């Protein structure tokens, strides 16, 4: 059983009907009591309580509940009192009701329900509103989208069993030629393969595709379809592979940032409460490093909150090892990171017809005088590669006998100046400066230290070292030594050597590495007391092993000690040490995703971490910023463009957009 709401307690409907009637007596009502009663009884039990409440007081419990309760709490409670099928039927009903259509709700349900759930959905809709749900959906939908919904609606997907190795091989071929191999995608073929084959088969097919092709099936889909249809197809894919991970995602997006998408929050927490909430919880904590529970807590309030938390659970015997579903998703994130062929692309490309003489002039004319023309500067610099900017710098000083850097630092100011000068600096020097500004001054800007050092490559590090010695007349190691100390200094200096192995995998050694990991974390038995960590062995592995090899270690680690390394590190480790290793891990797992996260974080909450924003935007400008934006939009349901637009203003907002890739 993977449902959160315990499979029944040992009740009697009559005692609850009396307890609930009681809670609703007098002025007001005992919300805590109603909440505690209804959220600790399974749905079946709740149907009986309804039956009892009816025979004892001759009334409708739900009606009485709608009377005493209001708002989110009302909705949620009542939502919990209706049978699953009747539940889905009103969500779809309401999704279709009104002029606007909630396509997100439609997708989530039609993409996640099994053949049987589908049948009971249709049947309940027929009884509740006395109407055909298929005609209603066709009446509110259009195109390939409506086609796929209608197919999913039939509830006739092949059963899981007879695995035709050959048919799997065939569907991979058909899917590859219907997509990757042509401009656009054969929608029809995808609607047929993904809508009829069993979930079992489709999984086997997605794996063969990823292995046979250098990419996941989704990579061939994303950006090759259009509108709601793309979103829909992407959702059946995620559901086939893992519906619990899908809901884990939908849950995260409903609480993204300012505000909540309550209705969705209600739909999921309730509908999945007796199916796979526990699985959802596990996956959620592996992809968001923050309880489903914690986020439900910090984004809701009152008895409404109370209930949601109940429907989830968030302390049932601490963390504990993975269950099948989550272990697969975890294992697969690594597999993917390990074998996927990905094109790393930046957003700033060399300008064509590049004329340094023309730019150098324009830049000067834009500054020459009392005023100062920001647009010319911003528009020129942001749209010119770094290599091209150095040329402009040489040409500028040759034409006017004055340094372009010095003039710019004079004509512009604020966040813009930090961003413009930043672009103007050669890469190895820019990071050297940032490293310099994280140690220079009182205290240490740890975050910026980890970011740079757990992220840059050997070639980049060797360069940063020289760039550093040349600009500040000192080595990077020693500069590190002064500003920091303890374990943090050690890991920071190891990484900064830029000697990390660049060699291939190696199974045997991976298992040995993971073993020390298992030890570093798992410390039960008599040494139950957290004996912290196990030697410098762990640090050497995370700091000096090759990325391809680490992905192996982390994969074997999961096979072995049933946890994910990132999880356990947060366990036995803390502060700058915990954070340094986690950054390392995330860097090898999905570097682009790591920068996306940091961006989200820098504009999340109260104000803006203007420094982190530009550091990333500048240094990733010509590497993987496009990949970054792809990840960003995927995980945060919002484009990088929109985020920047709502967190910054002025010319800074101007220069930032001009640097950022194509909206999204
Ligand atoms: Ca009352
Ligand atoms: Ca929110
Ligand atoms: Ca001026
Ligand atoms: Ca300092
Ligand atoms: Ca903000």
UniProtKB/Swiss-Prot annotation:
Which superkingdom is the protein from? Eukaryota
Q: Name positions with the PTM Phosphotyrosine.
A: 21, 192
A GO molecular-function annotation: phosphatidylserine binding
Q: Which UniProt keywords apply?
A: Acetylation, Annexin, Calcium, Calcium/phospholipid-binding, Cytoplasm, Phosphoprotein, Repeat
List every position bearing N6-acetyllysine. Answer: 54, 59, 66, 72, 297, 361, 409, 474, 611
Induction (free text): By Epstein-Barr virus (EBV).
Tell where it localizes: Cytoplasm; Melanosome
The residue spans of each Annexin repeat are 11-82, 83-154, 166-238, 242-313, 354-425, 426-497, 512-586, 590-661
Query: Where is it mostly found?
Result: cytoplasm
In terms of Gene3D superfamilies, this protein maps to:
Annexin
Protein's GO biological process: apoptotic signaling pathway; calcium ion transport; mitochondrial calcium ion homeostasis; monoatomic ion transmembrane transport; negative regulation of sequestering of calcium ion; regulation of muscle contraction
Q: What else is known?
A: Seems to bind one calcium ion with high affinity.
What task does this protein carry out? May associate with CD21. May regulate the release of Ca(2+) from intracellular stores.
Report the family membership.
Belongs to the annexin family.
The entry's protein name is Annexin A6
Organism field: Homo sapiens (Human)
């Amino acid at each position: 059983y993977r449902g959160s709401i315990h499979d029944f307690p040992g009740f009697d409907p009559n005692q609850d009907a009396e307890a609930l009637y009681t809670a609703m007596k007098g002025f007001g009502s005992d919300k805590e009591a109603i909440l505690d009663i209804i959220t600790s009884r399974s749905n079946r039990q709740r149907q009986e309580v309804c039956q009892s409440y009816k025979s004892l007081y001759g009334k409708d419990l739900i009606a009485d509940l709608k009377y005493e309760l209001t708002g989110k709490f009302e909705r949620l409670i009542v939502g919990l009192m209706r049978p699953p099928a009747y539940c889905d039927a009103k969500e779809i009903k309401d999704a279709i009701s009104g002029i606007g259509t909630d396509e997100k709700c439609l997708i989530e349900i039609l993409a996640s329900r099994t053949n049987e759930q589908m049948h009971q959905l249709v049947a309940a809709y027929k009884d509740a509103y006395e109407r055909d749900l298929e005609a209603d959906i066709i009446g509110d939908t259009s195109g390939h989208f409506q086609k796929m919904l209608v197919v999913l609606l039939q509830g006739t997907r092949e059963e899981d069993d007879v695995v035709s190795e050959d048919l799997v091989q065939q569907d991979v071929q058909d899917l590859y030629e219907a997509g990757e191999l042509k401009w656009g995608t054969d929608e029809a073929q995808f609607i047929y393969i993904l809508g009829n084959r069993s979930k079992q088969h489709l999984r086997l097919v997605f794996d063969e595709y990823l292995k046979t092709t250098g990419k996941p099936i989704e990579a061939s889909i994303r950006g090759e379809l259009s509108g709601d249809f793309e979103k829909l197809m992407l959702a059946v894919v995620k559901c086939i592979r893992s519906t619990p991970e899908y809901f884990a995602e939908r849950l995260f997006k409903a609480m993204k940032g300012l505000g909540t998408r309550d209705n969705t929050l209600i739909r999921i927490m309730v509908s999945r409460s007796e199916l796979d909430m526990l699985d959802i919880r596990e996956i959620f904590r592996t992809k968001y490093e923050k309880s489903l529970y914690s986020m439900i807590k910090n984004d809701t309030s009152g008895e409404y909150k109370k209930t949601l938390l109940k429907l989830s659970g968030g302390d049932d015997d601490a963390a504990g090892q993975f269950f099948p579903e989550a272990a697969q998703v975890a294992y697969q994130m690594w597999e993917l990171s390990a074998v996927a062929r990905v094109e790393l692309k930046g957003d700033v490309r060399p300008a064509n017809d590049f004329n340094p003489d023309a730019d150098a002039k324009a830049l000067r004319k834009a500054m020459k005088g009392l005023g100062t023309d920001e647009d010319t500067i911003i528009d020129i610099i942001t749209h010119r590669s770094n290599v091209q900017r150095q040329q402009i710098r040489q040409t500028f000083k040759s034409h006017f006998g004055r340094d372009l850097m010095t003039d710019l630092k004079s004509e512009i100011s604020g966040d813009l100046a930090r961003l413009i000068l930043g672009l103007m600096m050669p890469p190895a020097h820019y990071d050297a400066k940032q490293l310099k500004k994280a140690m220079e001054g009182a205290g240490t800007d740890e975050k910026a230290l980890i970011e740079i050092l757990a992220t840059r490559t050997n070639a980049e590090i060797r360069a940063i070292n020289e760039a550093y010695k040349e600009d500040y007349h000192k080595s990077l190691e020693d500069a590190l030594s002064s500003d920091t100390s303890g374990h943090f200094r050690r890991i920071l200096i190891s990484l900064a050597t830029g000697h990390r192995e660049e060699g291939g995998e190696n199974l045997d050694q991976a298992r040995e590495d993971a073993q020390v990991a298992a030890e570093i974390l798992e410390i039960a038995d008599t040494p139950s007391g957290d004996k912290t960590s196990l030697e410098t062995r762990f640090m050497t592995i995370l700091c000096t092993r090759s990325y391809p090899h680490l992905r192996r270690v982390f994969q074997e680690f999961i096979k072995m000690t049933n946890y994910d390394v990132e999880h356990t590190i947060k366990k036995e480790m803390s502060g700058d040490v915990r954070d340094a290793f986690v950054a390392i891990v995330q860097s090898v797992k999905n570097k682009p995703l790591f920068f996306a996260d940091k961006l989200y974080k820098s504009m999340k909450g109260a104000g803006t971490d203007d420094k982190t924003l530009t550091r990333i935007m500048v240094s990733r400008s010509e590497i993987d910023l496009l990949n970054i934006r792809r990840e960003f939009i995927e995980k945060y349901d919002k484009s990088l463009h929109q985020a920047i637009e709502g967190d910054t203003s002025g010319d800074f907002l101007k220069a930032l957009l001009a640097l950022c890739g194509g909206e999204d």
